[PDB]
């Protein structure tokens, strides 16, 4: 198959001619890719931010005329997937305590997300 | 967005209270014995209530006057902000890029340079939504790619940006640069065609590869590309066209900024757009 064949041919031509250049550039790119990975609190912060903008975006989609709404099943399955894709030891027993006890009802869910976002932004600002 | 958050937290608010206020005042009128079945008048009056109770239209200008230690610096900053925001509005208008929320617009506080991230154009799947006709002005037996804009406003010129630019610079620097850019792009005898052809074609290929129907690969795809290119070139040449009769240059641009700053259009957009700021 011609795409990866042509890409490996171009990489081989770029590696034989100028080998020192390709070596230094690949070592630089690899060290940036391994060492500038974000920590646990920054990943939790960006996860809570994308969850909060999706919650306030779906709450304004006119789901109902909003008597006392409830969460859809796909958002709950997405966040129970994200809870297993979170950090294991210490984030999960506190993140799981905020969707088992019927905290998702589109009002305490957004209030919980705002509380967690404010606490995380104060934690990252005291770094 | 950072400037808006500093203004909200300098007082006793946080900008999710704006969403809470519009949700409560929009939910308090769906009830029985209907006082407002019309959503537009209620949306306009809660827009004015947001602009008066929470965020006045002098926040950005006051922040930037407090930012610089001299008025020469603020005056030169505003003089460059008007030209760079005119270029940003042109880049948002041509190629039909999406909603420019105030966290996607970045400003350099040492030059006045404006740029934006998430420069993703809006491609609507319908060929059905169009003020123009389907058959005669353009011929497309497929229907998927159109490059259309969804927003009520033609671009983003909110009250706070308009109070920062002022009245003299919005008339003499914003609209005139927005006119001369589109005049300079249609002069050089089809460079717009040559750039926009392949940069539209890659967007068409990504549009047919995002949704899993990549099998339509034919000169019909070139017809889609040329149709979208002619549409974008027509909308660009609409700005820089001066009439044969004596008419103010920057008149279509002034009508566009009249339709982009009216509260009857800014109230009909989403709350993540932040039309008050």
Chain B residue nearest residue A118, CA to CA: B14
Chain A residue nearest residue B23, CA to CA: A60
Nearest one of B261, B258, B254 to B276, comparing CA atoms: B261
DSSP annotation string for B103-140: TSEEE-TTT--EEES---B---S-SS--SS-SSSS---
A59 touches chain B (CB under 8 A): yes
Is A66 in contact with B27 (Cβ distance < 8 A)?
yes
Q: What is the DSSP letter of B94?
A: G
Angle between helix axes A40-58 and A73-84 (nearest 10 degrees) is: 180
Whether B254 and B137 have beta carbons less than 8 Å apart is answered as: no
Choose the mutation target among A49, A53, A54, A56 for the interface with B, i.e. most B CBs under 10 Å: A56
Is A60 in contact with B30 (Cβ distance < 8 A)?
no
A60 touches chain B (CB under 8 A): yes
Instruction: Give me B166's structure tokens.
Output: 């002022």
Choose the mutation target among A66, A69, A106, A119 for the interface with B, i.e. most B CBs under 10 Å: A66
Chain B residue nearest residue A110, CA to CA: B16
Chain B residue nearest residue A61, CA to CA: B270
Is A56 in contact with B272 (Cβ distance < 8 A)?
yes
Nearest one of B237, B55, B87 to B155, comparing CA atoms: B87
Contacts of B16 in chain A (CB under 8 A): 56, 114
Environment class of residue A101 by beta-carbon count within 10 Å: exposed (0-12), middle (13-18) or buried (19+)?
A: exposed
Nearest one of B150, B144, B149 to B126, comparing CA atoms: B144
Is A56 in contact with B19 (Cβ distance < 8 A)?
yes
Q: Give the Å distances, CA to CA, from B38 to B41, B92, B216.
A: 6, 31, 44
Give the count of Cβ contacts less than 8 A between chain A and B.
16
* Distance between CA atoms of residues B70 and B75, nearest Å: 9
* Distance between CA atoms of residues B226 and B198, nearest Å: 10
Phi/psi class of residue B96: alpha, beta or left (left: φ > 0; alpha: ψ in -120 to 50)?
Answer: left
Nearest one of B72, B82, B70, B221 to B141, comparing CA atoms: B221
Give the SS3 label for residue B97: strand
Place of tokens 């537009």: B40
A70 touches chain B (CB under 8 A): no
Q: Give the Å distances, CA to CA, from B148 to A59, B121, B122, B231.
A: 26, 9, 6, 10
Place of tokens 């041919």: A9
Nearest one of A34, A75, A37, A31 to A56, comparing CA atoms: A75
Indicate the residue of B16, B30, B270 with minimum beta-carbon distance to A60.
B270
Whether B126 and B91 have beta carbons less than 8 Å apart is answered as: no
Is B272 in contact with A57 (Cβ distance < 8 A)?
yes
Q: Taken in order B215, B218, B220, B222, is the CA torsion positive or negative?
A: positive
User: CA of B80, closest CA in chain A: separation in Å?
Assistant: 32
Three state DSSP letters for A28-96: HHHHHHHHCCCCHHHHHHHHHHHHHHHHHHHCCCCCCCCCCCCCCHHHHHHHHHHHHCCCCCCCHHHHH
Give the SS3 label for residue B267: coil
Is A66 in contact with B30 (Cβ distance < 8 A)?
yes
Chain B residue nearest residue A65, CA to CA: B30
Choose the mutation target among B14, B30, B42, B102 for the interface with A, i.e. most A CBs under 10 Å: B30
Element holding B51 (H helix, E strand):
helix B39-53
Contacts of A57 in chain B (CB under 8 A): 272
* Distance between CA atoms of residues B231 and B75, nearest Å: 38
């Amino acid at each position: 198959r011609q795409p990866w064949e042509y890409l490996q041919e171009l990489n081989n031509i770029l590696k034989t001619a100028y080998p020192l250049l390709a070596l230094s550039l690949e070592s630089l790119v690899a060290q940036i890719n391994d060492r500038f990975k974000s920590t646990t609190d920054e990943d939790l912060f960006r996860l809570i931010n994308v969850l909060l903008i999706d919650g306030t975006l779906n709450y304004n989609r006119l789901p109902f005329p909003r008597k006392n709404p409830k969460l859809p099943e796909n958002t709950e399955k997405n966040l129970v997937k994200f809870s297993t894709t979170l950090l294991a030891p210490y984030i999960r027993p506190k993140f799981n305590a905020d969707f088992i006890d019927n905290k998702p009802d589109y009002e305490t869910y957004i209030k919980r997300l705002r509380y967690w976002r404010r606490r995380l932004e104060n934690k990252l600002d005291r770094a | 967005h950072e400037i808006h958050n500093e203004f909200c937290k300098k007082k006793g608010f946080d900008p999710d209270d704006i969403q809470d206020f519009m949700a409560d005042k929009l939910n308090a009128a769906h009830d029985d014995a209907l006082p407002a079945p019309d959503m537009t008048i209620l949306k306009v009056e809660i827009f004015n209530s947001i602009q008066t109770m929470f965020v006045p239209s002098n926040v950005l200008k006051d922040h930037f006057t407090s930012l610089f230690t001299q008025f020469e610096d603020f005056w030169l900053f505003r003089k460059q902000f008007a030209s760079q925001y005119s270029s940003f509005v042109f880049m948002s208008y041509m190629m039909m890029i999406n909603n420019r929320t105030p966290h996607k617009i970045h400003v350099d506080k040492t030059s006045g340079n404006v740029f934006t991230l998430e420069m993703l154009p809006s491609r609507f799947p319908y060929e059905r939504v169009k003020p123009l006709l389907k058959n005669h002005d353009l011929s497309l037996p497929p229907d998927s790619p159109i490059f259309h804009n969804n927003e009520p406003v033609p671009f983003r010129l909110t009250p706070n940006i308009q109070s920062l630019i002022g009245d003299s610079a919005l008339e003499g620097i914003f609209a005139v640069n927005l006119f001369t850019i589109s005049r300079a792009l249609i002069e050089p005898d089809n460079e717009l065609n040559t750039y926009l052809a392949l940069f539209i074609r890659d967007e068409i290929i990504s549009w047919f590869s995002n949704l899993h129907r990549p099998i339509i690969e034919n000169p019909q795809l070139r017809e889609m590309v040329q149709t979208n290119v002619d549409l974008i070139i027509r909308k660009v040449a609409q700005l820089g066209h001066l009439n044969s009769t004596p008419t103010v240059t920057t008149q279509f641009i002034l009508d566009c900024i009249g339709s982009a700053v009216s509260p009857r259009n800014l109230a009909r957009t989403d709350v993540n757009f932040m039309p008050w700021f």
